[PDB]
Amino acid sequence: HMTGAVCPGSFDPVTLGHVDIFERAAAQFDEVVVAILVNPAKTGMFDLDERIAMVKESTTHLPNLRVQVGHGLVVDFVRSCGMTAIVKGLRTGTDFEYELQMAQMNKHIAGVDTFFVATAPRYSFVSSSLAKEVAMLGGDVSELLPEPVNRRLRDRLN
Amino acid sequence: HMTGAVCPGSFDPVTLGHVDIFERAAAQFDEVVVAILVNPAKTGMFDLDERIAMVKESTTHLPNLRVQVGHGLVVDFVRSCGMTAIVKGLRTGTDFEYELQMAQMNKHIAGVDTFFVATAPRYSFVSSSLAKEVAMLGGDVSELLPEPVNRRLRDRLN
Amino acid sequence: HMTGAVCPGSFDPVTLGHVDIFERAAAQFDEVVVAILVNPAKTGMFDLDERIAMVKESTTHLPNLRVQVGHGLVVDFVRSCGMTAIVKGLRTGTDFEYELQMAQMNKHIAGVDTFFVATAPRYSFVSSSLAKEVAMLGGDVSELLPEPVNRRLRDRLN
Amino acid sequence: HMTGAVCPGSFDPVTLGHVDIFERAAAQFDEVVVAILVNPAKTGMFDLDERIAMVKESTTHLPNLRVQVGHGLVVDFVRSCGMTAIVKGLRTGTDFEYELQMAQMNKHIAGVDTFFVATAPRYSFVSSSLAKEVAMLGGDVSELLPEPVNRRLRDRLN
Amino acid sequence: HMTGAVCPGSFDPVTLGHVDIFERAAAQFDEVVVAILVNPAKTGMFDLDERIAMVKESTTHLPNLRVQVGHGLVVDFVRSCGMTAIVKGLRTGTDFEYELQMAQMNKHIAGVDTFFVATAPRYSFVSSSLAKEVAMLGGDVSELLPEPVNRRLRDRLN
Amino acid sequence: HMTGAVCPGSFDPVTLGHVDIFERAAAQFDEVVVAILVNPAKTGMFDLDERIAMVKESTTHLPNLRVQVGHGLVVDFVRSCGMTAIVKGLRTGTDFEYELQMAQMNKHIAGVDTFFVATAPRYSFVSSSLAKEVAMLGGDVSELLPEPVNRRLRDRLN
Ligand SMILES: CC(C)(COP(=O)(O)O)[C@@H](O)C(=O)NCCC(=O)NCCS
Ligand SMILES: CC(C)(COP(=O)(O)O)[C@@H](O)C(=O)NCCC(=O)NCCS
Ligand SMILES: CC(C)(COP(=O)(O)O)[C@@H](O)C(=O)NCCC(=O)NCCS
Ligand SMILES: CC(C)(COP(=O)(O)O)[C@@H](O)C(=O)NCCC(=O)NCCS
Ligand SMILES: CC(C)(COP(=O)(O)O)[C@@H](O)C(=O)NCCC(=O)NCCS
Ligand SMILES: CC(C)(COP(=O)(O)O)[C@@H](O)C(=O)NCCC(=O)NCCS
Ligand code: NI
Ligand code: NI
Ligand code: NI
Numbered sequence: 001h002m003t004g005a006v007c008p009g010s011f012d013p014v015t016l017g018h019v020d021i022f023e024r025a026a027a028q029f030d031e032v033v034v035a036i037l038v039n040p041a042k043t044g045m046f047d048l049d050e051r052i053a054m055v056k057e058s059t060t061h062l063p064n065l066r067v068q069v070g071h072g073l074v075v076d077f078v079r080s081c082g083m084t085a086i087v088k089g090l091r092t093g094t095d096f097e098y099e100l101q102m103a104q105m106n107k108h109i110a111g112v113d114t115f116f117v118a119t120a121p122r123y124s125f126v127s128s129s130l131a132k133e134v135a136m137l138g139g140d141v142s143e144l145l146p147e148p149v150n151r152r153l154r155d156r157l158n
Numbered sequence: 159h160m161t162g163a164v165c166p167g168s169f170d171p172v173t174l175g176h177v178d179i180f181e182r183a184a185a186q187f188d189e190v191v192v193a194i195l196v197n198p199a200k201t202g203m204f205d206l207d208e209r210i211a212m213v214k215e216s217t218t219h220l221p222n223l224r225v226q227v228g229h230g231l232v233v234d235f236v237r238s239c240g241m242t243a244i245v246k247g248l249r250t251g252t253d254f255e256y257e258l259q260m261a262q263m264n265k266h267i268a269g270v271d272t273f274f275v276a277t278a279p280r281y282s283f284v285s286s287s288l289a290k291e292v293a294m295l296g297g298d299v300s301e302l303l304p305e306p307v308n309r310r311l312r313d314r315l316n
Numbered sequence: 317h318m319t320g321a322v323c324p325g326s327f328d329p330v331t332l333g334h335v336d337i338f339e340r341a342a343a344q345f346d347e348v349v350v351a352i353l354v355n356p357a358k359t360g361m362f363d364l365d366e367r368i369a370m371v372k373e374s375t376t377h378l379p380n381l382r383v384q385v386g387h388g389l390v391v392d393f394v395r396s397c398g399m400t401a402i403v404k405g406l407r408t409g410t411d412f413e414y415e416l417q418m419a420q421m422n423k424h425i426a427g428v429d430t431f432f433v434a435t436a437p438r439y440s441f442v443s444s445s446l447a448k449e450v451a452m453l454g455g456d457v458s459e460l461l462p463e464p465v466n467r468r469l470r471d472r473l474n
Numbered sequence: 475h476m477t478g479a480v481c482p483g484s485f486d487p488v489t490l491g492h493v494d495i496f497e498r499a500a501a502q503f504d505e506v507v508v509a510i511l512v513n514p515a516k517t518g519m520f521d522l523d524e525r526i527a528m529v530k531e532s533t534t535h536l537p538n539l540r541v542q543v544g545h546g547l548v549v550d551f552v553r554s555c556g557m558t559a560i561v562k563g564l565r566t567g568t569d570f571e572y573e574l575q576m577a578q579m580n581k582h583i584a585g586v587d588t589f590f591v592a593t594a595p596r597y598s599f600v601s602s603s604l605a606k607e608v609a610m611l612g613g614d615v616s617e618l619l620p621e622p623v624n625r626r627l628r629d630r631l632n
Numbered sequence: 633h634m635t636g637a638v639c640p641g642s643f644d645p646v647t648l649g650h651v652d653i654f655e656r657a658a659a660q661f662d663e664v665v666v667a668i669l670v671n672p673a674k675t676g677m678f679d680l681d682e683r684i685a686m687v688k689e690s691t692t693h694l695p696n697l698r699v700q701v702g703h704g705l706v707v708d709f710v711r712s713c714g715m716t717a718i719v720k721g722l723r724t725g726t727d728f729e730y731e732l733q734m735a736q737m738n739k740h741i742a743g744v745d746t747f748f749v750a751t752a753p754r755y756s757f758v759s760s761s762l763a764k765e766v767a768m769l770g771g772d773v774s775e776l777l778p779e780p781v782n783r784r785l786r787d788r789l790n
Numbered sequence: 791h792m793t794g795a796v797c798p799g800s801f802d803p804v805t806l807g808h809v810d811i812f813e814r815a816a817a818q819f820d821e822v823v824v825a826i827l828v829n830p831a832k833t834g835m836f837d838l839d840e841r842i843a844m845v846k847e848s849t850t851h852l853p854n855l856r857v858q859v860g861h862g863l864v865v866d867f868v869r870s871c872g873m874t875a876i877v878k879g880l881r882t883g884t885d886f887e888y889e890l891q892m893a894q895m896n897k898h899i900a901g902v903d904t905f906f907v908a909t910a911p912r913y914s915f916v917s918s919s920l921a922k923e924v925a926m927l928g929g930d931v932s933e934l935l936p937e938p939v940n941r942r943l944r945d946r947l948n
Binding site for chain 5: 475477479498501502503504558559561564570574577578581587588589590591592594595
């Protein structure tokens, strides 16, 4: 009877584009799980613990959302939660053809459905990679990231 | 804790691509409403009552799905159902940029979220318009349409 | 040393997406001409004089912008102004491949350059056609259109 | 060991973009058939006999190419020629997603393969529709159309 | 008199999407050559010998196809075969703009034509990279790869 | 009163596609600055000094253009020139969604406008990366690059 969606990603760091999508999922599904899946072949900026903390600290307003680590196939994580749905955001710059390819693959291997939702226009041009690039060069992306992330970026400059 | 999505469209006629999406919505939301909205400036093949019957007859396996007519804004229909979500299918040939434009407009005017889902590959190249075109020229699209639709299409050539 | 761009379109009616682009052109070129060209085979809502008035009334803050009518090729209009550049806006739902085709054709036939600019995100999902559709069905698009347009749109439902 | 492709379209009128593709097909297949199929619900400029003549007159340098009319499904035309392949050109402004949809539909209903080829850059921005539009407004598209077409287009303005 | 196409790629490993395209090329050209071109700057999973063996073992049903190694420009390989045509598959996730760029480049430098064909829907979401990723994480992509490839992936787990 | 645009890039090496765009910018803005911004995380082929020299040597026909190095955010460079406009070219293979994302980001952080222009068809399929790849394998891309670049590539073979 209880519905549910997983919002998977690398979240290095989580942005307000991601939070917008978490909010939509939390509004439309009984339970939401944010799954952090780190790429074993891309050294990111933030370690796993920091990524988890940034998501948790940025989602306290969503009572029906929790945050977990995923270690293998996203579909294995989804099924482990007793769920069969993934929610993914679309923004300016999304590789949509690759998202579609992954969605079809995920449906084939595990029967998991993927629902795509367009990010709010004001948060439609932030991405983790571009936010880091701009921030590291001294640009102000603070309006595009949650305050828990802004705090950690400010300390990353030190 | 009750969740819900509306699957809106003109469904002239409903295809197995549409049914695939109804199935995904019905699996992931507590209730689904198929909303038939007609373009008052379009040369529809089937009248509204035939469209309703085809959708109903093609969805008897989905116990939490109902079929209704809308006469104005899709967002007004969605809210009249006590819902705030739309589910739309993607296929080969979808005008995705227009779908994105409508999704953003619908969110702006009424706060309604739109979730997009990729149709199953076998049903990814049928559309109402192309099915009608092929059928009228004697082609066999019966594997891409529900039997309630095939029946009526066959009676149109009789 | 005098520079200039033409912003052509049907503007039926002008939107805040269009005004955003007029503003960018006016900031970057010495003179801007808004060129209203009407599709002689299109069911326009507003007559040419109403379209001109709406553009003029919506651009009083741009001192280097003027509004004129064109009756043939956009390139012939551009050259009649003593200019060789067109500025076109991009939004969610733009048929960009057609815009690219026209740009290449316009360069071929008359040497006229086309510059494309992305509309501000808040105005990225309004279009003349969708604004009219929503307004006629009772939806509120007033935040996406200039007040001179809202006034006339309200008088059309009166 | 005999190979063959059909190049279908409305060719109203044939352009140098189309001729470029005919040339590639003729270089790569033993026989090529240009198939003229008319949209019975389209306001074509040139009648079917004029379209045939323009194609024939523009392809005299291709000895393994013939021109024929089709009246129903393109796949039925292709099979009537003893062939199982279609060659379609891509240009700036092509509705590629619709082309992909038709290709998949054509393969489904008749087993016919579709091969897409990018038009030469110099001919990549002409289309029948845009050429007619520009020509009717007095623009010079003569470098983008075969001389047999230019002749007839000039006689239409006479 | 004999027609021919080259199907180039890295094939690390060959998938059923690739085989589908080989089948189309073999049906429409007198001879087909699969050319394996290894990227000297991307350590793949399978060495050149294994890639060749997987393609050969997966194409025994295509009597007019052979498999060869290419060492430099794909167009140099194509011309060395006495051919002037390349056939490339399209799938969900194809970087089509890059494929188009390469096609135009290949035509410019060597006069070689590229024909694109859409993969069968059931094989439209497999790619070499995604199949490896899923397989390495214990997912079942065996329905998307030829048995000669499945055998080698099973041994890669050991 | 003086208008201006910056044409930023990595230019490793500059191509005739880039020069085409420099020419358009120089025709439409009082002053143009080509800004070379080297990626600190991608070893290119040519060092910064060589990149600058190739651009300068290839633009002597543009009296109102100068060439400079940028060291951080492109928007910081643009504002340092007393300008607020960037001009970027589009070609076959452009990652347009990423260009749009950067344009929206650049507008957000610094109020800088980006104008996109389509490259001339004959120069629409060259890119720095593809030109290097083809040249290094002995292909002739000399018609797609300025002679100052061709000279340095010939010496790179030695
Ligand atoms: C984590 C992610 C969703 C990518 O997320 P990101 O775009 O936020 O980096 C994707 O890499 C993923 O699902 N990884 C787990 C591995 C997997 O399941 N691969 C199969 C994809 S079909
Ligand atoms: C019915 C439909 C979803 C289109 O469906 P279709 O693609 O199945 O024909 C769309 O035309 C619609 O929403 N119509 C109702 C009017 C409306 O709400 N218009 C504003 C859209 S932003
Ligand atoms: C007016 C417009 C720019 C379209 O504008 P719109 O998209 O705002 O309706 C276009 O239809 C146009 O240029 N019309 C004039 C005729 C012409 O020049 N046609 C040839 C175009 S390559
Ligand atoms: C003729 C054409 C190829 C379109 O050609 P055009 O783009 O040159 O106008 C297409 O309309 C067609 O195939 N018509 C015949 C009817 C048909 O087969 N329809 C089904 C297509 S999947
Ligand atoms: C091998 C391939 C076709 C890529 O194939 P892939 O997409 O299967 O990896 C491409 O990298 C290639 O053609 N390489 C040979 C080098 C070359 O010719 N480069 C020039 C391209 S225009
Ligand atoms: C230099 C370039 C324009 C890329 O140019 P290229 O596409 O020619 O390599 C881009 O990497 C850039 O702007 N770099 C400076 C760093 C920056 O400003 N990043 C923020 C982008 S929003
Ligand atoms: Ni519930
Ligand atoms: Ni000036
Ligand atoms: Ni033969």
